[PDB]
Structures are given as structure tokens and as C-alpha cells.
Design a protein around this nucleic acid. Structure first.
Ligand SMILES: Nc1ncnc2c1ncn2[C@H]1C[C@H](O)[C@@H](COP(=O)(O)OP(=O)(O)OP(=O)(O)O)O1
Ligand SMILES: [Mg+2]
Ligand SMILES: [Mg+2]
Lengths: 552, 392
DNA sequence: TAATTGCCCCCCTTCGGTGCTTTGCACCGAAGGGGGGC
């Protein structure tokens, strides 16, 4: 099998091996499993067992990417529950945008990757399984795994560590060769001539074979484009492997989920992909088979995404001697796109940000969140942060980050004048407005009858109390502020006893998940000067205690 | 020393955060050198534990230093000179390297596992575990205490006026001597440590709560003052408003000038006198934990309160970079956190739990780029805006 | 009810836990679905 040292694995303390019965299998699956198991037994990958082993775990088979070949899987869920914890060494997924341009490239795959790594001997008894006989009568043949099984939660980490150990000497001897390893997939890039590169590839294959890792010629790619990790790699550009969007007349919940996932995958290189209207169709749904009609907003978004996907796009390879630039654009409804490039119109990567964090937000906070997401992704892919081009004025960002109560920062960035600019839609006055009317607003609600009232008693004698149903105290305070905004002129001073409403409004939101806050925002945008003042509620401050009984 | 976890504890299982290319290269070089001399050893995935790692470039030092976030391990591990705060000059010395001489208990080594990431995930992360006492773990000083006392005994007896305290990896050595004499003593201590194998706590002023002074008060001004006094009522029992509240009677314009009555002026003077005196009845309980709240006041100004119970502050201060360009808010907050932690270690010997006025994602993205210390205080993030700036 | 597997990254939605003062509301992490990888 391999001279690789096994990784010592143990069960969780006090646990025993699984004893799960084999479920019935179809004749095609049984024949495929019989053939695979016979070949594995001949090579010593599995061993026949008898009555001395009391464990069992169901087996089954699926089709591989290359059809006419079967992958044998074991439903090790019980054993996985009773297996010790592992720490995963795979910390992420390599991206072609992080690849540097190489003169010669080769993609290798090892055949029967897991089955070439031996399994810990003391653990082998727990991997017992039974191949059922064709039809019935004669009992199935019982085996145990001598190698890493597919379906066991310890197999991926063990294989990845073993492959790293195997590749360490070759990488030490050849520091000028770039080797990306993802499980058993090896991208090998070099600046050597094609003949020298192929000699190095043969040396690497011999090195792997010395460890029992065969590299069949079927999975050995020698000419571009290279199919690597879902991408097609050309000498000077990379694309995603073709994305086929489903074409359905009636859409179910599962179909919408699949479409949204495929669009999210496509958004890494196709600019302008939007999924917000399609994702909104998944809110409140219960059954995955329930048919969701499109809402004429998801239809427009789907048409736009299809139009975007019509034209083939490509990314370029990283040039470490140049600068990373990330351009951000707003799209509306909390959606943003971004392009990471080093030369103009030559995108390394593309992406979107549409997370709705928080009940109330503005454009500046969302832009900061998008910048943070781009920064962390760029640190992952290229190990450095890019220079940003944001549709926000330097003055606007200065005002926001100097007046905001939280610490906020954006790395080295430059303003770009793209028409949908980012701005704060209203500003709260730092001092009270002379000559303007002053409202003392108040709102109360009993937490038993779910009813309350709200008013805006004015210094000039004006007053109005409105009753409110099914509302809480916070809703009554927000409604009182809304009342003050409604019946005031272009300039108004407002005094309230609600630090919740103050906390909401002082953040300067422009969108909210509450319609009351949205109406308040509309009124605030309509006004010219607004000053908001807080006051301790039951402390005799006149106005907010002069007539809060009006609403209490 | 056979260390053990706290009863019923499992072990750290914290994921590694992504690192920049320079940090990863520095970590790879440092860990290769460490593995060459046996300080760390490569491990596999059958070890289920993990702590995050990164690298820092210390103050005006061109050498990268590896830093391990052992906060979970420190919380899970089962393992102070009152005159140091009154000293004149305190110098902090890094004595972490010494910890690399004493081996670590075998059964505990698995808890010190960490993973070096890769740029663009080119390879699976490389796992290591410590064979010797690691820097940043709270058990390392508790194990090296005997050797530290043995090394420092020839110095403390020769210099009885110098107060030396040890926290994690840092020796805070303080003296009441001249700054040149202090530097000479520091050089002596260095030489002594090598052969045996710039704070100023006197200027740590508190930040009191000051009421505003004005020759003419408006309804808005009196309202803000009454709110401030109502908030201070939880901190200074016996503070009063009454007459100031009586001034705010009826509905009046916020810009209306309202004269101060005799009772109101007298009570305002009394309130100012009460605020001037420090709060009485606060004592540092070593059993409870320290909580440090930070508020951003603008113009490069920050305020903070270290307390063990709410509304009973043990220290109030104001960190200030005074702008000086420095548009980086995260750098300012990181420097404030480091200074507050150093003050808390000097005064009480315990790092405080920080309530950072920042979004979590921004902090985890950018804090490592400005960190200069070898310790990491535990912190949580507050998502509630302060009502009115009452420490300004 | 079927088909039954494992690890990794991502997005989007839902739900329970936590905190703070305002037992309602905001925020966050885990888990469900999906995409991609092997
Ligand atoms: N669907 C899956 N379920 C479980 N493990 C999987 C799955 N796909 C891949 N793996 C694991 C086990 C494989 O040995 C390893 C490498 O993947 P892969 O190249 O597809 O197969 P393989 O090495 O077994 O066979 P071969 O290359 O000969 O077709 O990744
Ligand atoms: Mg393979
Ligand atoms: Mg493969």
C-alpha cells in the first residue's frame, strides 16, 4: 500500500464501535461494490473478517465525476459520532486569482487517494462492513478497512497531512517549483522550459510512486486549458468552468436555493450578479417542494443575471510587482459589487456584498462592512490588502468617522466619481435651533393590554395625543418622535425621554427593518435642521413631565 | 512541572485567522528556526486543539516576533506589589526568551498546538506544538517563578529600592531614582540577566466628572446638566438636582435664557464640590474580574473607566493622541487598549476585560497590525451608543 | 419519505441564546438549505 506512517486514532472515551445493519442495495450497486471490494482485497486495501469482529457499518456506492466508475462510501455517521475529534488542516480554498503567471503548468491527480494511505491498525476493527450477496440467501462477505475509508470524518485531515509529509522533500529540493495541493490534486507551475518542466514532473511522479501514490496518465493534464478546482486555466487568463443556470417554468424552494447558490458561485468572476430579490423568495417558506411564484422583482434580477452570464468573462493572474486595486460600486437595496484588479479593465476577481447586518443601517456602515469583507478576502488570496476606490467623498467619510461613536476605519482609499455616490442623507444639529419650534414628545404603553399613547406637547401651546394599538413602549416613543416630525416646520427641536429612539436616530440610518423608522427617516430627510435632545423621564423636567400624563 | 487543566475543561479549539504575506513569511522563518532547536515540533491532525498565532513588529524593532493567543488556554489552565504604582519610573523588560530554556510537561504539550496558514491556501496549514514553555501562556511564569527568583535574588538584595513585578512575559521594574540612574540600573539588570542565564506612574491622573461653567444658562443647558447629574447620582450618592429640575418647569424653548435662582446656584456649587471629591467606598477585590469600558469622544480623544462593579469605578482616565493627523481610529483604539492594559497590570496585576467601542469584524481585521505587546486582554464588543458623553 | 458518507470555503434564512434596561429589542453564532472543491 504505502510506507507512510499511520496516524494513531482512538475512539471517544467510553464509546464502542458501531453495529449498524446494512440496508438493502440494488443489484447494480451490489455488483459494483463486489468488483471494487475484490480488487481492494487483492491489493490488501481491505481484509476479510469473521465472527471475531462484532461491528458493522452500511456501505453504498455513488458515481464519480468520471462516470462508468464507482466511488465506495461508508455511512460512518455512528463511528464519526464515536470517533475522537480532529483538527482540520485545510483552512480554505485556493483561488486562481492568487496564482502567478508560470511558463509551464501541469495538473496531476493521484489514483485512489484515500486507499493509498494506511489506516491505524487498532482502529481497523471499527471499519467493518458487509457486502450483501446478490439477491439473498447466502450471507454477505464481511471486510474491514486497512486504509483510509471514504465517509469517515478522520480521513480528510489524515490524508492531507500525509500528502504534505510526502511532498515536503520534493518541495525542499525544488524551491523554484510552485505546488498547490488540495487533497490529491496537485497544480505544478514553473518557469522552466517545457522539456525541463516535464522532466521535473516525471521526477515528482517517481517521488510520489516511491510512497505508493500512483498518478494515472488519465488524470494527468499536460496541455491548456487545465481543469483545476472548478476553473479553466489558460496561459494568461482563467475562467470558471461553465455555469448552467436552471431553466424552470415553475420554481420550487429547492430550485430557488440552487439558483441562488449558483449565482453566488458565478459572482466571483461575473460582475453585477444580484440575488437579493431571489433570496427574498426564500423567506417564510416551509417545504422545499413548495412552488414559489416569481414576484416580478426576482424576474428582473434573474433576467439581469442571465444577461450578465451570457458574455464569457475571465480573470487574470496575480502580478506581485504591481498594486492591488479594489473598486466598489453601489447597486441599491443594500447591495454592492466590487472588482479587484491590478490593471484597468483586467479583473483579478469580482464579488458582491449584500449582507443585511443590523435592524437599522446606512450606506456608510454597509460600505465599511463591504470594505472589511474585501480586505479579509484579499488577505486570504494575495496576502496583502488592496487600495480601495470608493464612491464616497473624503468629506463625507471624514464627517461620519469623526462624528460616529464607534471606531471605524477604511484602509488607503481614493474617491471615485461613479454616479451612485455614498452620502449621509441627513445631519442632526449639535446645538438647539433658535426661533424653531420645540416639541416635548412622550410615549407610553401598558405591557399587559398591549396599548399605549404618544404626544408632542409644544412650547407654543400646541399638543396632540394619539392612541396606539398592539404597540410596545419603544414603538410608542418612536411614534411620538414621528408625530413631532410630522407636524413641524422645516426646522424643529425635539426632546424625548427615550434613549432607544435616540440610539436609533443618532446613528443616521437611511434604511430599516421597521416601517416606523423608515417613515421617521423620510421625515428627517425632508427637514432642513433637526436637533434631538434626551431628558430623564420621571425627574420633573417640564414638558416631558408637564404633559406626559396626556399619554400616560 | 506537571500542569493540568481546570477541572471539567477540554482545551482550546480556536481557529486560525488569515494573515498577511509578510506575517506568514516571518512566522515560517521563525518556526523553522524554532523547530531546528527543538522548541516546537510538527504535529498531525489527530491533535484536536488549536490556538491562533500571528506576528508583530515591536516598538522600533526590525525583528518579527511570534505571538500566540493563549487566552482560551489561560482561562482553562489550573495553576502583587502595592508600591509599584507609587514608583517614579517603571521600565518593562521582555524576559520571554528565558521560557524557551525550561521544557514543558509532555501531557500538556498537546494543548499548545497552533497552525501556520498559507497564502492562497496553497498547502494545508502546518501544525506545531510547543516542547518548551511557550510565550503568552499563564503557566509559563508560574513554572519559571523559582528560576526567576533565583536569578533576581542577587539584584533585589543589592537594590532594595527597586520594585520588580512579573506578569506573563514582562518584568515591570520600578525605581524612584533619576532617569539616567534608572537607565543605568536597567542596563545593570540586563547584564545581570544575561550573565545569570518607560512608564511614569506618578503622572497617572484620574479623570473627574466636571459640570460645565457658564455666565448664562439656557433651558437646553439646564436640561443637559440635569441629565448629567441624574447619571452621576448612581456614581456619587448624595448628589441632588431638585432646584435645577424646578427650573425646568413648564414647556419652554430650548434656546430661552433662564436665570439661575439662588437655591439653584447654591445647589450647583454643592454638586460641583461633591463631584470634585473622589468617590468613597470602592475597594479592589482580587477575586472579581476587571472591566474596562472605552468611549470615543472625537478629535483623537478617548475616555475609559476600569471598574469591578457597575457605577463603582476604580480608575477613570482619558487617552488622547491629540489628533496630530493620525486618521486611523483602529490604531488609536489599539494603542489605548495597550496603555490601559499596562496601567491595569501595574496597578492591580490583572489585565481587564475590555468593552471595545468597535465592530467585531473591524477589530479582528486590523488589531494585529498595530499590536505591540506580548499579552492579549480578553475583550467583548459593545453595540450600544452611549447616551450622552458624560466623561468629557 | 426517501436517499442515506466525510472534510474545507462561501451566501442567505431561521432560531435560540445573551445582554441591557426599556422583559422588548438588538446582535450574534450555530444550524438548515444551497453553491463550489476534493
Ligand atoms: N464524494 C466524496 N465523498 C467522500 N470522500 C470523497 C469524495 N470525493 C472525494 N473524496 C475524497 C476521497 C478520495 O480518495 C479523495 C480524492 O478524490 P478523487 O480524486 O475524486 O478520488 P480517488 O482518489 O478516490 O480516485 P480516482 O482519482 O482514482 O478517481 O477525496
Ligand atoms: Mg484522485
Ligand atoms: Mg483530485
Amino acid at each position: 500500500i504505502s510506507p507512510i506512517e499511520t496516524v494513531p486514532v482512538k475512539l471517544k472515551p467510553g464509546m464502542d464501535g458501531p453495529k449498524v445493519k446494512q440496508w438493502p442495495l440494488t443489484e447494480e450497486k451490489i455488483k459494483a461494490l463486489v468488483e471494487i471490494c475484490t480488487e481492494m482485497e487483492k491489493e490488501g486495501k481491505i481484509s476479510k473478517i469473521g465472527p471475531e469482529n462484532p461491528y458493522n457499518t452500511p456501505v453504498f456506492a455513488i458515481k464519480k465525476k468520471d462516470s462508468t466508475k464507482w466511488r465506495k462510501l461508508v455511512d460512518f455517521r455512528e463511528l464519526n459520532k464515536r470517533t475522537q475529534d480532529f483538527w482540520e488542516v485545510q483552512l480554505g480554498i485556493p483561488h486562481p486569482a492568487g496564482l502567478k503567471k508560470k511558463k509551464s503548468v501541469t495538473v496531476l491527480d493521484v489514483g485512489d487517494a484515500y486507499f493509498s494511505v494506511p489506516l491505524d491498525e487498532d482502529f481497523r476493527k471499527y471499519t467493518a462492513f458487509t457486502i450483501p450477496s446478490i439477491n439473498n440467501e447466502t450471507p454477505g462477505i464481511r471486510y474491514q478497512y486497512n486504509v483510509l475509508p471514504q465517509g469517515w470524518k478522520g480521513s480528510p485531515a489524515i490524508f492531507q497531512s500525509s500528502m504534505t509529509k510526502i511532498l515536503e522533500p520534493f518541495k525542499k529540493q525544488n524551491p523554484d517549483i510552485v505546488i498547490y495541493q488540495y487533497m490529491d490534486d496537485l497544480y505544478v507551475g514553473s518557469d522552466l522550459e517545457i522539456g525541463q518542466h516535464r522532466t521535473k514532473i516525471e521526477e515528482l511522479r517517481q517521488h510520489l510512486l516511491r510512497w505508493g501514490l500512483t498518478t494515472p496518465d488519465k488524470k494527468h493534464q499536460k496541455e491548456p486549458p487545465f481543469l483545476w478546482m472548478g476553473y479553466e486555466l489558460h496561459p494568461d487568463k482563467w475562467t470558471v468552468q461553465p455555469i448552467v443556470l436552471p431553466e424552470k417554468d415553475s420554481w420550487t424552494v429547492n430550485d430557488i436555493q440552487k439558483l441562488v447558490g449558483k449565482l453566488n458561485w458565478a459572482s466571483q468572476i461575473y460582475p453585477g450578479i444580484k440575488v437579493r430579490q431571489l433570496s427574498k423568495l426564500l423567506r417564510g417558506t416551509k417545504a422545499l417542494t413548495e412552488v414559489i411564484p416569481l414576484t416580478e422583482e426576482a424576474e428582473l434580477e434573474l433576467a439581469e443575471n442571465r444577461e450578465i452570464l451570457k458574455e464569457p468573462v475571465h480573470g487574470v493572474y496575480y502580478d506581485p510587482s504591481k498594486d492591488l486595486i479594489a473598486e466598489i460600486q453601489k447597486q441599491g437595496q443594500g447591495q454592492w459589487t466590487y472588482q479587484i484588479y491590478q490593471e484597468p479593465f483586467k479583473n483579478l476577481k469580482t464579488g458582491k456584498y449584500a449582507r443585511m447586518r443590523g435592524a437599522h443601517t446606512n450606506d456608510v456602515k454597509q460600505l465599511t462592512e463591504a470594505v472589511q469583507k474585501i480586505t479579509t478576502e484579499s488577505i486570504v488570496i494575495w496576502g496583502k490588502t488592496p487600495k480601495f476606490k470608493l464612491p464616497i467623498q473624503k468629506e463625507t467619510w471624514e464627517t461620519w468617522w469623526t462624528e460616529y461613536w464607534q471606531a471605524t476605519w477604511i484602509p488607503e482609499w481614493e474617491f471615485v466619481n461613479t454616479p451612485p455616490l455614498v452620502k449621509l442623507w441627513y445631519q442632526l444639529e449639535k446645538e438647539p435651533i433658535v426661533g424653531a419650534e420645540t416639541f416635548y414628545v412622550d410615549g407610553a404603553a401598558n405591557r399587559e393590554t398591549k396599548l399605549g399613547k404618544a404626544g408632542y406637547v409644544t412650547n407654543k401651546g400646541r399638543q396632540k395625543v394619539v392612541p396606539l394599538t398592539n404597540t410596545t413602549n419603544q414603538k410608542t416613543e418612536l411614534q411620538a418622535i414621528y408625530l413631532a416630525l410630522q407636524d413641524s416646520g422645516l426646522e424643529v427641536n425635539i426632546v424625548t425621554n427615550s434613549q432607544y429612539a435616540l440610539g436609533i436616530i443618532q446613528a443616521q440610518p437611511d434604511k430599516s427593518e421597521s416601517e416606523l423608522v423608515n417613515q421617521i427617516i423620510e421625515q428627517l430627510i425632508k427637514k432642513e435642521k433637526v436637533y434631538l435632545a434626551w431628558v430623564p423621564a420621571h425627574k420633573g423636567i417640564g414638558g416631558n413631565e408637564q404633559v406626559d400624563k396626556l399619554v400616560s | 512541572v506537571p500542569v493540568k487543566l481546570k477541572p471539567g475543561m477540554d482545551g482550546p479549539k480556536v481557529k486560525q485567522w488569515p494573515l498577511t504575506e509578510e506575517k506568514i513569511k516571518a512566522l515560517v522563518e521563525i518556526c523553522t528556526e524554532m523547530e531546528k532547536e527543538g522548541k516546537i515540533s510538527k504535529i498531525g491532525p489527530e491533535n484536536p486543539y488549536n490556538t491562533p498565532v500571528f506576528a508583530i513588529k515591536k516598538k522600533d524593532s526590525t525583528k518579527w516576533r511570534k505571538l500566540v493567543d493563549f487566552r482560551e488556554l489561560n482561562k482553562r489552565t489550573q495553576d502583587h506589589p502595592a508600591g509599584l504604582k507609587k514608583k517614579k519610573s517603571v521600565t518593562v523588560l521582555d524576559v520571554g526568551d528565558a521560557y524557551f530554556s525550561v521544557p514543558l510537561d509532555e501531557d500538556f504539550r498537546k494543548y499548545t498546538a497552533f497552525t501556520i496558514p498559507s497564502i492562497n491556501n496553497e498547502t494545508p496549514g502546518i501544525r506545531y506544538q510547543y516542547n518548551v514553555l511557550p510565550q503568552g501562556w499563564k503557566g509559563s511564569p508560574a513554572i519559571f517563578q523559582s528560576s526567576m527568583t533565583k536569578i533576581l535574588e542577587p539584584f533585589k538584595k543589592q537594590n532594595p529600592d527597586i520594585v520588580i513585578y512579573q506578569y506573563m512575559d514582562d518584568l515591570y521594574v520600578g525605581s524612584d531614582l533619576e532617569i539616567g540612574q534608572h537607565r543605568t540600573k536597567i542596563e545593570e539588570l540586563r547584564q545581570h540577566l544575561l550573565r545569570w542565564g518607560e512608564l511614569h506612574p506618578d503622572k497617572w491622573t484620574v479623570q473627574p466628572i466636571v459640570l460645565p461653567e457658564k455666565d448664562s444658562w439656557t433651558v437646553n443647558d439646564i436640561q443637559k446638566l440635569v441629565g448629567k447629574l441624574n447619571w452621576a447620582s448612581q456614581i456619587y450618592p448624595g448628589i441632588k438636582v431638585r432646584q435645577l429640575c424646578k427650573l425646568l418647569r413648564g414647556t419652554k424653548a430650548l434656546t430661552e435664557v433662564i436665570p439661575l435662582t439662588e437655591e439653584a446656584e447654591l445647589e450647583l456649587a454643592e454638586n460641583r464640590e461633591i463631584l470634585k471629591e473622589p468617590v468613597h467606598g470602592v475597594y479592589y477585590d482580587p477575586s472579581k474580574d476587571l472591566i474596562a469600558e472605552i468611549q470615543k469622544q472625537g478629535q483623537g480623544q478617548w475616555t475609559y473607566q476600569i471598574y469591578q462593579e457597575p457605577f463603582k469605578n476604580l480608575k477613570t482616565g482619558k487617552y488622547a493622541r491629540m489628533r496630530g493627523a493620525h486618521t486611523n481610529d483602529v490604531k488609536q483604539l489599539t494603542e489605548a487598549v495597550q496603555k490601559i492594559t499596562t496601567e491595569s497590570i501595574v496597578i492591580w496585576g490583572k489585565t481587564p476585560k475590555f468593552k471595545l467601542p468597535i465592530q467585531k469584524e473591524t477589530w479582528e481585521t486590523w488589531w494585529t497590525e498595530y499590536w505591540q505587546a506580548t499579552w492579549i486582554p480578553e475583550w467583548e464588543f459593545v453595540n450600544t451608543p452611549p447616551l450622552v458623553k458624560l466623561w468629557y
